[PDB]
Amino acid sequence: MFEKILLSNPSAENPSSLRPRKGIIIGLGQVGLACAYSMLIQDCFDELVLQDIASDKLEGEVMDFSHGMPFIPPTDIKAGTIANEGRNADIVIITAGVAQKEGESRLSLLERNIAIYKKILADVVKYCPEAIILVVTNPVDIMTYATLKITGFPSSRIIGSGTVLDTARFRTLLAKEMDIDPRSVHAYIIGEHGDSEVPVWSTANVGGMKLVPNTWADLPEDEKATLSGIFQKVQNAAYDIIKLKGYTSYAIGLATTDIVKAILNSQERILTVSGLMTGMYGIEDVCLSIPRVVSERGIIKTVNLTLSEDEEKLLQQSAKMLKEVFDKIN
Amino acid sequence: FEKILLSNPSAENPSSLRPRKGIIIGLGQVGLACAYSMLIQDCFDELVLQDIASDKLEGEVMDFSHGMPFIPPTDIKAGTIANEGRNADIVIITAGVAQKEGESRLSLLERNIAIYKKILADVVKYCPEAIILVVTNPVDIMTYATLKITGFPSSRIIGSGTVLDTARFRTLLAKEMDIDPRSVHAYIIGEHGDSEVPVWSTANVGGMKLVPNTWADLPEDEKATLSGIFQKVQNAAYDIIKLKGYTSYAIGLATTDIVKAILNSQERILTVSGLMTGMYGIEDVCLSIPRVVSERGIIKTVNLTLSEDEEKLLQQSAKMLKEVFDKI
Amino acid sequence: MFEKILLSNPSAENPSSLRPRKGIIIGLGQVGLACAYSMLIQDCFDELVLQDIASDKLEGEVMDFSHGMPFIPPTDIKAGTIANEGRNADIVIITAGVAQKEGESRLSLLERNIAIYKKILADVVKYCPEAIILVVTNPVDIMTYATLKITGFPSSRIIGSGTVLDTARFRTLLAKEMDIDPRSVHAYIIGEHGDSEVPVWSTANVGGMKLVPNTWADLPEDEKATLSGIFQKVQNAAYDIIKLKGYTSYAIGLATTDIVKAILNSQERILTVSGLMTGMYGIEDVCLSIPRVVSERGIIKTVNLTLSEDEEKLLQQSAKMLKEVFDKIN
Amino acid sequence: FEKILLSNPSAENPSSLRPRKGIIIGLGQVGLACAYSMLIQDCFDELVLQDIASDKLEGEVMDFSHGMPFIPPTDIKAGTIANEGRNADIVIITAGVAQKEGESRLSLLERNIAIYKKILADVVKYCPEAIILVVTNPVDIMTYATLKITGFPSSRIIGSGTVLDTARFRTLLAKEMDIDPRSVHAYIIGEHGDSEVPVWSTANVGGMKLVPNTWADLPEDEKATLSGIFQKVQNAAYDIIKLKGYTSYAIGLATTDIVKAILNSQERILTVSGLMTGMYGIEDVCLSIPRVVSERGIIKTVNLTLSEDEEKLLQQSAKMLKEVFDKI
Ligand SMILES: NC(=O)C1=CN([C@@H]2O[C@H](COP(=O)(O)OP(=O)(O)OC[C@H]3O[C@@H](n4cnc5c(N)ncnc54)[C@H](O)[C@@H]3O)[C@@H](O)[C@H]2O)C=CC1
Ligand SMILES: NC(=O)C1=CN([C@@H]2O[C@H](COP(=O)(O)OP(=O)(O)OC[C@H]3O[C@@H](n4cnc5c(N)ncnc54)[C@H](O)[C@@H]3O)[C@@H](O)[C@H]2O)C=CC1
Ligand SMILES: NC(=O)C1=CN([C@@H]2O[C@H](COP(=O)(O)OP(=O)(O)OC[C@H]3O[C@@H](n4cnc5c(N)ncnc54)[C@H](O)[C@@H]3O)[C@@H](O)[C@H]2O)C=CC1
Ligand SMILES: NC(=O)C1=CN([C@@H]2O[C@H](COP(=O)(O)OP(=O)(O)OC[C@H]3O[C@@H](n4cnc5c(N)ncnc54)[C@H](O)[C@@H]3O)[C@@H](O)[C@H]2O)C=CC1
Ligand SMILES: O=P(O)(O)OC[C@H]1O[C@](O)(COP(=O)(O)O)[C@@H](O)[C@@H]1O
Ligand SMILES: O=P(O)(O)OC[C@H]1O[C@](O)(COP(=O)(O)O)[C@@H](O)[C@@H]1O
Please tell me the distance from the alpha carbon of residue D28 to that of residue D34, in angstroms, as a whole number.
10
Nearest of B96, B75, B104 to residue B31 by alpha carbon? B96
- SS3 string, chain D, reads CCCCEEECHHHHCCCCCCCCEEEEECCCHHHHHHHHHHHHCCCCCEEEEECCCHHHHHHHHHHHHHCHHHCCCCEEEECCCCCCCCCCCEEEECCCCCCCCCCCHHHHHHHHHHHHHHHHHHHHHHCCCCEEEECCCCHHHHHHHHHHHHCCCHHHEEECCCHHHHHHHHHHHHHHHCCCHHHEECCEEECCCCCCEECHHHCEECCEECCCCCHHHCCHHHHHHHHHHHHHHHCHHHHHHHHHCCCCHHHHHHHHHHHHHHHCCCCEEECCEEEEECHHHCEEEEEECCEEEECCEEEEEECCCCCHHHHHHHHHHHHHHHHHHHCC
DSSP designation for A79: E
Please tell me the distance from the alpha carbon of residue A51 to that of residue A85, in angstroms, as a whole number.
10
Contact predicate C180/B292, CB 8 Å? yes
Nearest of B267, B283, C168, B17 to residue D89 by alpha carbon? B17
**Distance between first and last Cα of chain D:** 57
Nearest of B88, B127, B143, B40 to residue B262 by alpha carbon? B88
Contact predicate A287/A141, CB 8 Å? yes
Distance in Å, CA A329 to ligand 1 centroid: 20
What are the chain D neighbours of B268 within 8 Å (beta carbons)? 73
List Cβ neighbours of A300 (8 Å cut-off, separation of 6 or more): A156, A268, A292, A293, A294, C8, C9, C12
Catalytic site residue C193? yes
Q: Does D69 touch chain C (CB under 8 A)?
A: yes
Q: Does B117 touch chain D (CB under 8 A)?
A: no
Q: Is D117 exposed, middle or buried (0-12, 13-18, 19+ CB in 10 A)?
A: exposed
Q: Does D182 touch chain A (CB under 8 A)?
A: yes
What amino acid is encoded at D264 in this protein?
A: N
Nearest of B167, B275, B172, B148 to residue B228 by alpha carbon? B172
DSSP designation for A192: -
A203: distance to nearest CA of chain C, Å? 15
Nearest of D96, D92, D36, D94 to residue D66 by alpha carbon? D36
List Cβ neighbours of A35 (8 Å cut-off, separation of 6 or more): A25, A93, A95, A136, A252, A253, A256, A257
Q: Does B266 touch chain A (CB under 8 A)?
A: no
How far is the CA of C300 from the CAs of C28, C135, C166, C280, D101, in angstroms? 29, 17, 22, 15, 51
Nearest of A218, C141, B300 to residue D7 by alpha carbon? B300
Q: Does A183 touch chain B (CB under 8 A)?
A: yes
What are the chain B neighbours of C184 within 8 Å (beta carbons)? 267-269, 292
Contact predicate C259/C159, CB 8 Å? yes
Distance in Å, CA B137 to ligand 2 centroid: 8
What are the chain D neighbours of B151 within 8 Å (beta carbons)? none
Q: How far is it between the farthest Cα atoms of chain B?
A: 79
Pairing of strands D268-270, D291-294: antiparallel
Tell me the HSE value of A235 on the side-chain side, using a 13 A CA sphere. 15
User: Across the interface, do C267 and A8 touch by the CB < 8 Å criterion?
Assistant: no
Contact predicate B180/C269, CB 8 Å? yes
Please tell me the distance from the alpha carbon of residue A69 to that of residue B183, in angstroms, as a whole number.
11
What amino acid is encoded at C310 in this protein?
A: D
Q: Does the beta carbon of A140 sit less than 6 angstroms from any atom of ligand 1?
A: yes
- Residue identifier of the C-alpha nearest atom 4 of ligand 3: C136
Q: Does the beta carbon of B127 sit less than 6 angstroms from any atom of ligand 2?
A: no
Tell me the HSE value of D284 on the side-chain side, using a 13 A CA sphere. 7
Q: Is D175 exposed, middle or buried (0-12, 13-18, 19+ CB in 10 A)?
A: middle
Interface test with C, best of B264, B265, B302 (most C CBs within 10 A): B302
- SS3 string, chain B, reads CCCCEEECHHHHCCCCCCCCEEEEECCCHHHHHHHHHHHHCCCCCEEEEECCCHHHHHHHHHHHHHCHHHCCCCEEEECCCCCCCCCCCEEEECCCCCCCCCCCHHHHHHHHHHHHHHHHHHHHHHCCCCEEEECCCCHHHHHHHHHHHHCCCHHHEEECCCHHHHHHHHHHHHHHHCCCHHHEECCEEECCCCCCEECCCCCEECCEECCCCCHHHCCHHHHHHHHHHHHHHHCHHHHHHHHHCCCCHHHHHHHHHHHHHHHCCCCEEECCEEEEECHHHCEEEEEECCEEEECCEEEEEECCCCCHHHHHHHHHHHHHHHHHHHHC
Please tell me the distance from the alpha carbon of residue B261 to that of residue D323, in angstroms, as a whole number.
51
What amino acid is encoded at C64 in this protein?
A: D
Give the atom of ligand 2 at the shortest distance from the alpha carbon of B250: 44
How far is the CA of D198 from the CAs of A37, A99, D190, D215, in angstroms? 42, 48, 9, 12
3-state DSSP assignment of residue A92: strand
Please tell me the distance from the alpha carbon of residue D61 to that of residue D36, in angstroms, as a whole number.
11
Please tell me the distance from the alpha carbon of residue B79 to that of residue B225, in angstroms, as a whole number.
49
DSSP designation for A99: P
Please tell me the distance from the alpha carbon of residue A25 to that of residue A31, in angstroms, as a whole number.
10
Nearest of D60, D48, D58, D51 to residue D19 by alpha carbon? D48
Please tell me the distance from the alpha carbon of residue A269 to that of residue D181, in angstroms, as a whole number.
8
| Stated resolution in angstroms | 2.6
Distance in Å, CA D164 to ligand 5 centroid: 16
Please tell me the distance from the alpha carbon of residue D302 to that of residue D279, in angstroms, as a whole number.
10
Angle between helices A237-245 and B54-66 (to 10 degrees): 140
Contact predicate A124/A82, CB 8 Å? yes
Domain annotation for chain A: domains and CATH numbers: 22-163 (3.40.50.720), 164-329 (3.90.110.10)
Contact predicate A58/A49, CB 8 Å? no
Residue-level length of chain D? 328
What technique was this entry resolved by? X-ray
Ramachandran region of residue B78, left (φ > 0), alpha (ψ -120 to 50) or beta? beta
Give the atom of ligand 6 at the shortest distance from the alpha carbon of D69: 20
List Cβ neighbours of A205 (8 Å cut-off, separation of 6 or more): A186, A187, A211, D202
Distance in Å, CA D134 to ligand 4 centroid: 11
Tell me the HSE value of B49 on the side-chain side, using a 13 A CA sphere. 29
Q: Does the beta carbon of B249 sit less than 6 angstroms from any atom of ligand 2?
A: no
Please tell me the distance from the alpha carbon of residue A76 to that of residue A47, in angstroms, as a whole number.
4
Please tell me the distance from the alpha carbon of residue A182 to that of residue A169, in angstroms, as a whole number.
9
- Residue identifier of the C-alpha nearest atom 9 of ligand 2: B136
Q: Does the beta carbon of B269 sit less than 6 angstroms from any atom of ligand 6?
A: yes
How far is the CA of B265 from the CAs of A265, B260, B280, D45, D72, in angstroms? 32, 8, 28, 7, 10
Question: Does an H or E element contain A142, and which?
Answer: helix A140-151
Contact predicate C92/C83, CB 8 Å? no
User: Across the interface, do A266 and C157 touch by the CB < 8 Å criterion?
Assistant: no
Q: Is A180 exposed, middle or buried (0-12, 13-18, 19+ CB in 10 A)?
A: buried
C29 annotated to bind ligand: yes
Nearest of D42, D43, D50 to residue D25 by alpha carbon? D50
Q: Using alpha carbons only, what angle is made at residue A19 by residues A14 and A21, rounded to the nearest 5 degrees?
A: 150
Please tell me the distance from the alpha carbon of residue B170 to that of residue D157, in angstroms, as a whole number.
49
What amino acid is encoded at A154 in this protein?
A: P
Q: Which chains touch A (3 or more CB pairs under 8 A)?
A: B, C, D
Contact predicate B59/B127, CB 8 Å? no
What residue in B sits closest to A211 (Cα-Cα)? B4
Please tell me the distance from the alpha carbon of residue D38 to that of residue D32, in angstroms, as a whole number.
10
Q: Does B1 touch chain A (CB under 8 A)?
A: yes
Give the atom of ligand 5 at the shortest distance from the alpha carbon of D187: 3
List Cβ neighbours of D72 (8 Å cut-off, separation of 6 or more): B264, B266, D42
Measured over the CA atoms of residue C255, residue C257, residue C263 and residue C266, the dihedral's sign is negative
D73: distance to nearest CA of chain B, Å? 6
Contact predicate C50/C77, CB 8 Å? yes
3-state DSSP assignment of residue A122: helix
User: Across the interface, do D73 and C181 touch by the CB < 8 Å criterion?
Assistant: yes
DSSP designation for A23: E
Cα dihedral value C53, C57, C63, C67, nearest 10: -120
Please tell me the distance from the alpha carbon of residue C278 to that of residue C161, in angstroms, as a whole number.
18
Contact predicate D189/D197, CB 8 Å? yes
How far is the CA of A176 from the CAs of A190, B49, B66, in angstroms? 21, 18, 11
Please tell me the distance from the alpha carbon of residue D48 to that of residue D25, in angstroms, as a whole number.
9
Contact predicate D265/D294, CB 8 Å? yes
Q: Describe the strand order of the beta sheet including B208-209 as a list of residue ranges.
A: B184-185, B204-205, B208-209
How far is the CA of B76 from the CAs of B40, B79, B82, in angstroms? 12, 10, 17
Q: Does the beta carbon of D182 sit less than 6 angstroms from any atom of ligand 5?
A: yes
List Cβ neighbours of B225 (8 Å cut-off, separation of 6 or more): A1
Please tell me the distance from the alpha carbon of residue C200 to that of residue C190, in angstroms, as a whole number.
7
Question: Does an H or E element contain A288, and which?
Answer: strand A284-289
User: Across the interface, do C184 and B269 touch by the CB < 8 Å criterion?
Assistant: yes
Q: Using alpha carbons only, what angle is made at residue D8 by residues D5 and D10, rounded to the nearest 5 degrees?
A: 170
User: Across the interface, do C303 and B185 touch by the CB < 8 Å criterion?
Assistant: no
Question: Does an H or E element contain A127, and which?
Answer: helix A110-127
Active site residues of A: 193
How far is the CA of B45 from the CAs of A183, A185, B262, in angstroms? 16, 19, 14
User: Across the interface, do D296 and B14 touch by the CB < 8 Å criterion?
Assistant: yes
Please tell me the distance from the alpha carbon of residue B126 to that of residue A1, in angstroms, as a whole number.
54
Q: Does the beta carbon of A248 sit less than 6 angstroms from any atom of ligand 1?
A: yes
Radius of gyration of chain D (CA): 21
Please tell me the distance from the alpha carbon of residue A159 to that of residue B325, in angstroms, as a whole number.
57
C206 phi/psi in degrees, rounded to 5: -130, 125
Q: Does the beta carbon of D273 sit less than 6 angstroms from any atom of ligand 4?
A: no
Please tell me the distance from the alpha carbon of residue A295 to that of residue A156, in angstroms, as a whole number.
10
Cα dihedral value C37, C42, C44, C46, nearest 10: 80
User: Across the interface, do C65 and D252 touch by the CB < 8 Å criterion?
Assistant: no
User: Across the interface, do C268 and B178 touch by the CB < 8 Å criterion?
Assistant: yes
Q: How far is it between the farthest Cα atoms of chain C?
A: 79
Q: Does the beta carbon of D285 sit less than 6 angstroms from any atom of ligand 4?
A: no
List Cβ neighbours of C149 (8 Å cut-off, separation of 6 or more): none
- Residue identifier of the C-alpha nearest atom 22 of ligand 3: C96
Q: Does B296 touch chain C (CB under 8 A)?
A: no
3-state DSSP assignment of residue A191: strand
β-strand partners of A49: A24, A78
Q: Does A306 touch chain D (CB under 8 A)?
A: yes
DSSP designation for A90: S
**Buried/exposed code over B27-37 (b: 16+ C-beta within 10 A; e: otherwise):** bbbbbbbbbbb
Nearest of C67, C18, C65, C70 to residue C39 by alpha carbon? C65
Q: Is B102 exposed, middle or buried (0-12, 13-18, 19+ CB in 10 A)?
A: exposed
Nearest of D126, D113, D89, D98 to residue D33 by alpha carbon? D98
Contact predicate C26/C120, CB 8 Å? yes
Exactly one of D46, D192, D237, D310 is catalytic; name it: D192
Q: Which long-range contacts (CB under 8 A, 24 or more apart) does D242-247 make?
A: D242/C60, D242/D101, D243/C56, D243/C57, D243/C59, D243/C60, D243/C63, D244/C56, D244/C57, D244/C60, D244/C61, D244/C64, D245/C60, D246/D29, D246/D30, D246/D98, D247/C64, D247/D29, D247/D30
Q: Describe the strand order of the beta sheet including B283-288 as a list of residue ranges.
A: B75-78, B46-50, B21-25, B90-93, B131-134, B157-159, B273-277, B283-288
Q: 10 Å Cβ neighbour count for D235? A: 12
Contact predicate D49/D61, CB 8 Å? yes
How far is the CA of C242 from the CAs of A211, C103, C169, D62, D105, in angstroms? 57, 9, 15, 11, 33
Please tell me the distance from the alpha carbon of residue C23 to that of residue C32, in angstroms, as a whole number.
13
Q: Does the beta carbon of A270 sit less than 6 angstroms from any atom of ligand 5?
A: yes
Nearest of C132, C159, C194, C185 to residue C272 by alpha carbon? C159
DSSP designation for A179: T
**Distance between first and last Cα of chain A:** 57
Point out the residue among C5, C6, C299 whose CB comes nearest to the CB of A9. Answer: C299
**Buried/exposed code over D156-169 (b: 16+ C-beta within 10 A; e: otherwise):** bbbbbbbbbbbbbb
Give the atom of ligand 1 at the shortest distance from the alpha carbon of A248: 43
Q: Is C195 exposed, middle or buried (0-12, 13-18, 19+ CB in 10 A)?
A: middle
Please tell me the distance from the alpha carbon of residue D63 to that of residue D321, in angstroms, as a whole number.
40
Contact predicate A65/A36, CB 8 Å? yes
**Distance between first and last Cα of chain B:** 58
